[PDB]
Design a protein around this motif. Sequence first.
Motif, PDB file in Angstrom:
ATOM      1  N   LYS A 114       0.868  -1.208  -0.007  1.00  0.00           N
ATOM      2  CA  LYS A 114      -0.033  -0.082  -0.031  1.00  0.00           C
ATOM      3  C   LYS A 114       0.818   1.377  -0.008  1.00  0.00           C
ATOM      4  O   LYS A 114       1.673   1.278   0.859  1.00  0.00           O
ATOM      5  CB  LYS A 114      -1.161   0.108   1.146  1.00  0.00           C
ATOM      6  CG  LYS A 114      -0.811   0.967   2.529  1.00  0.00           C
ATOM      7  CD  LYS A 114      -0.777   0.100   3.708  1.00  0.00           C
ATOM      8  CE  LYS A 114       0.435   0.247   4.436  1.00  0.00           C
ATOM      9  NZ  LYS A 114       0.780  -0.824   5.272  1.00  0.00           N
ATOM     10  N   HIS A 115       0.581   2.014  -0.899  1.00  0.00           N
ATOM     11  CA  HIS A 115       1.294   3.451  -1.164  1.00  0.00           C
ATOM     12  C   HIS A 115       0.495   4.565  -1.347  1.00  0.00           C
ATOM     13  O   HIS A 115      -0.274   4.512  -2.365  1.00  0.00           O
ATOM     14  CB  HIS A 115       2.322   3.421  -1.946  1.00  0.00           C
ATOM     15  CG  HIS A 115       3.528   4.315  -1.981  1.00  0.00           C
ATOM     16  ND1 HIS A 115       3.815   5.286  -2.790  1.00  0.00           N
ATOM     17  CD2 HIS A 115       4.436   4.439  -1.156  1.00  0.00           C
ATOM     18  CE1 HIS A 115       4.889   5.942  -2.351  1.00  0.00           C
ATOM     19  NE2 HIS A 115       5.359   5.554  -1.284  1.00  0.00           N
ATOM     20  N   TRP A 116       0.761   5.637  -0.934  1.00  0.00           N
ATOM     21  CA  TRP A 116      -0.351   6.734  -1.075  1.00  0.00           C
ATOM     22  C   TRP A 116       0.551   8.247  -1.321  1.00  0.00           C
ATOM     23  O   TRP A 116       1.663   8.524  -0.821  1.00  0.00           O
ATOM     24  CB  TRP A 116      -0.990   7.296  -0.023  1.00  0.00           C
ATOM     25  CG  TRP A 116      -2.501   7.112   0.112  1.00  0.00           C
ATOM     26  CD1 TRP A 116      -3.136   5.959   0.479  1.00  0.00           C
ATOM     27  CD2 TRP A 116      -3.380   7.744  -0.777  1.00  0.00           C
ATOM     28  NE1 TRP A 116      -4.639   6.094   0.140  1.00  0.00           N
ATOM     29  CE2 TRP A 116      -4.574   7.304  -0.793  1.00  0.00           C
ATOM     30  CE3 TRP A 116      -3.103   8.808  -1.558  1.00  0.00           C
ATOM     31  CZ2 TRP A 116      -5.892   7.694  -1.339  1.00  0.00           C
ATOM     32  CZ3 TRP A 116      -4.482   9.398  -2.252  1.00  0.00           C
ATOM     33  CH2 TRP A 116      -5.589   8.855  -1.934  1.00  0.00           C
ATOM     34  N   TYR A 169      -0.655  11.994  -1.141  1.00  0.00           N
ATOM     35  CA  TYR A 169      -1.668  12.870  -0.705  1.00  0.00           C
ATOM     36  C   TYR A 169      -1.197  14.335  -0.882  1.00  0.00           C
ATOM     37  O   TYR A 169      -0.195  14.718  -0.137  1.00  0.00           O
ATOM     38  CB  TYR A 169      -2.522  12.652   0.458  1.00  0.00           C
ATOM     39  CG  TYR A 169      -3.696  11.723   0.427  1.00  0.00           C
ATOM     40  CD1 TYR A 169      -3.848  10.877   1.129  1.00  0.00           C
ATOM     41  CD2 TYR A 169      -4.861  12.510  -0.273  1.00  0.00           C
ATOM     42  CE1 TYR A 169      -5.182  10.042   0.857  1.00  0.00           C
ATOM     43  CE2 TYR A 169      -5.929  11.617  -0.263  1.00  0.00           C
ATOM     44  CZ  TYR A 169      -5.950  10.550   0.294  1.00  0.00           C
ATOM     45  OH  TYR A 169      -7.318   9.601   0.350  1.00  0.00           O
ATOM     46  N   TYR A 170      -1.704  15.093  -1.632  1.00  0.00           N
ATOM     47  CA  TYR A 170      -1.195  16.555  -2.014  1.00  0.00           C
ATOM     48  C   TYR A 170      -2.107  17.556  -1.443  1.00  0.00           C
ATOM     49  O   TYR A 170      -3.376  17.407  -1.947  1.00  0.00           O
ATOM     50  CB  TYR A 170      -0.596  16.953  -3.382  1.00  0.00           C
ATOM     51  CG  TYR A 170       0.268  16.139  -3.705  1.00  0.00           C
ATOM     52  CD1 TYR A 170       1.037  15.137  -3.389  1.00  0.00           C
ATOM     53  CD2 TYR A 170       0.523  16.314  -5.225  1.00  0.00           C
ATOM     54  CE1 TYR A 170       1.938  14.452  -3.839  1.00  0.00           C
ATOM     55  CE2 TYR A 170       1.674  15.694  -5.843  1.00  0.00           C
ATOM     56  CZ  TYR A 170       2.456  14.529  -5.290  1.00  0.00           C
ATOM     57  OH  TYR A 170       3.334  13.776  -5.746  1.00  0.00           O
ATOM     58  N   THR A 171      -1.759  18.588  -0.462  1.00  0.00           N
ATOM     59  CA  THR A 171      -2.716  19.661  -0.187  1.00  0.00           C
ATOM     60  C   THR A 171      -3.266  20.497  -0.994  1.00  0.00           C
ATOM     61  O   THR A 171      -2.276  20.970  -1.503  1.00  0.00           O
ATOM     62  CB  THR A 171      -2.388  20.271   1.029  1.00  0.00           C
ATOM     63  OG1 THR A 171      -1.588  21.333   0.857  1.00  0.00           O
ATOM     64  CG2 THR A 171      -1.491  19.477   2.138  1.00  0.00           C
ATOM     65  N   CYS A 172      -4.250  20.544  -1.303  1.00  0.00           N
ATOM     66  CA  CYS A 172      -4.817  21.626  -2.385  1.00  0.00           C
ATOM     67  C   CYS A 172      -6.187  21.194  -3.015  1.00  0.00           C
ATOM     68  O   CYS A 172      -7.080  21.983  -3.455  1.00  0.00           O
ATOM     69  CB  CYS A 172      -3.763  21.583  -3.763  1.00  0.00           C
ATOM     70  SG  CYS A 172      -4.758  21.390  -5.238  1.00  0.00           S
ATOM     71  N   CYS A 173      -6.490  19.972  -3.195  1.00  0.00           N
ATOM     72  CA  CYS A 173      -7.639  19.679  -4.007  1.00  0.00           C
ATOM     73  C   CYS A 173      -8.073  18.240  -3.338  1.00  0.00           C
ATOM     74  O   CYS A 173      -7.716  17.271  -3.857  1.00  0.00           O
ATOM     75  CB  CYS A 173      -7.119  19.115  -5.343  1.00  0.00           C
ATOM     76  SG  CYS A 173      -5.362  19.377  -5.709  1.00  0.00           S
ATOM     77  N   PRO A 174      -9.062  18.395  -2.707  1.00  0.00           N
ATOM     78  CA  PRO A 174     -10.086  17.463  -2.050  1.00  0.00           C
ATOM     79  C   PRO A 174     -10.422  16.193  -2.966  1.00  0.00           C
ATOM     80  O   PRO A 174     -10.741  15.192  -2.475  1.00  0.00           O
ATOM     81  CB  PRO A 174     -11.211  18.306  -1.404  1.00  0.00           C
ATOM     82  CG  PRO A 174     -10.601  19.423  -1.122  1.00  0.00           C
ATOM     83  CD  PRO A 174      -9.777  19.907  -2.277  1.00  0.00           C
ATOM     84  N   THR A 216      -8.713  15.441  -5.928  1.00  0.00           N
ATOM     85  CA  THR A 216      -7.687  15.218  -6.822  1.00  0.00           C
ATOM     86  C   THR A 216      -6.404  14.507  -6.203  1.00  0.00           C
ATOM     87  O   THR A 216      -5.288  14.885  -6.309  1.00  0.00           O
ATOM     88  CB  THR A 216      -7.448  16.594  -7.536  1.00  0.00           C
ATOM     89  OG1 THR A 216      -6.303  17.239  -7.058  1.00  0.00           O
ATOM     90  CG2 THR A 216      -8.242  17.277  -7.763  1.00  0.00           C
ATOM     91  N   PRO A 217      -6.655  13.582  -5.361  1.00  0.00           N
ATOM     92  CA  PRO A 217      -5.764  12.803  -4.539  1.00  0.00           C
ATOM     93  C   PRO A 217      -5.098  11.615  -5.483  1.00  0.00           C
ATOM     94  O   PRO A 217      -5.532  11.093  -6.309  1.00  0.00           O
ATOM     95  CB  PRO A 217      -6.391  12.138  -3.536  1.00  0.00           C
ATOM     96  CG  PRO A 217      -7.796  11.928  -4.117  1.00  0.00           C
ATOM     97  CD  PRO A 217      -8.234  12.892  -5.136  1.00  0.00           C
ATOM     98  N   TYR A 218      -3.664  11.845  -5.467  1.00  0.00           N
ATOM     99  CA  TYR A 218      -2.894  10.739  -6.261  1.00  0.00           C
ATOM    100  C   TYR A 218      -2.467   9.530  -5.641  1.00  0.00           C
ATOM    101  O   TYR A 218      -1.734   9.657  -4.336  1.00  0.00           O
ATOM    102  CB  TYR A 218      -1.537  11.483  -6.801  1.00  0.00           C
ATOM    103  CG  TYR A 218      -1.884  12.855  -7.212  1.00  0.00           C
ATOM    104  CD1 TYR A 218      -2.866  13.448  -7.611  1.00  0.00           C
ATOM    105  CD2 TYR A 218      -0.771  13.646  -7.106  1.00  0.00           C
ATOM    106  CE1 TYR A 218      -3.117  14.675  -7.837  1.00  0.00           C
ATOM    107  CE2 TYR A 218      -0.756  14.839  -7.798  1.00  0.00           C
ATOM    108  CZ  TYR A 218      -1.876  15.466  -7.858  1.00  0.00           C
ATOM    109  OH  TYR A 218      -2.154  16.966  -8.351  1.00  0.00           O
ATOM    110  N   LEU A 219      -3.001   8.280  -5.739  1.00  0.00           N
ATOM    111  CA  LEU A 219      -2.830   7.037  -5.105  1.00  0.00           C
ATOM    112  C   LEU A 219      -1.480   6.365  -5.551  1.00  0.00           C
ATOM    113  O   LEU A 219      -1.136   6.905  -6.768  1.00  0.00           O
ATOM    114  CB  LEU A 219      -4.094   6.284  -5.099  1.00  0.00           C
ATOM    115  CG  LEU A 219      -5.361   7.024  -4.296  1.00  0.00           C
ATOM    116  CD1 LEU A 219      -5.532   8.398  -4.910  1.00  0.00           C
ATOM    117  CD2 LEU A 219      -6.359   6.058  -4.505  1.00  0.00           C
ATOM    118  N   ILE A 237      -1.089   2.266  -6.215  1.00  0.00           N
ATOM    119  CA  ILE A 237      -1.316   0.591  -5.911  1.00  0.00           C
ATOM    120  C   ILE A 237      -0.891   0.210  -7.251  1.00  0.00           C
ATOM    121  O   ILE A 237      -0.970   0.682  -8.279  1.00  0.00           O
ATOM    122  CB  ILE A 237      -2.985   0.728  -5.827  1.00  0.00           C
ATOM    123  CG1 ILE A 237      -3.188  -0.637  -5.908  1.00  0.00           C
ATOM    124  CG2 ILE A 237      -3.611   1.622  -6.593  1.00  0.00           C
ATOM    125  CD1 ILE A 237      -3.842  -1.199  -7.399  1.00  0.00           C
TER     126      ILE A 237
END
Lengths: 74, 25
Positions: free
Chosen positions: B6-8, B10-15, B17-20, B22
Amino acid sequence: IVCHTTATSPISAVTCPPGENLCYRKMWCDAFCSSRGKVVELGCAATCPSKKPYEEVTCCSTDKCNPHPKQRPG
Amino acid sequence: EERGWKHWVYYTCCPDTPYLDITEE
């Protein structure tokens, strides 16, 4: 305690039984300063390092205490 | 189908538009 760790598909909350249960919410630049957004990584450690020389690193040892500004239990 | 890790990202900015991270295949 529980921990909002950004690791799997969605925010994966994990309860750390051992001594290490600190929930850190550190952040740096992941395209925000560049193009997209800031960096957000949430985990469960025992000794949250204070890397505030540029990256916003917070330390909280409570269930689901590591939620991020962009996304959170709404 | 997803017997991996499992790898994530998360960039603060866009609720919304998260980049996951997997493993696809």
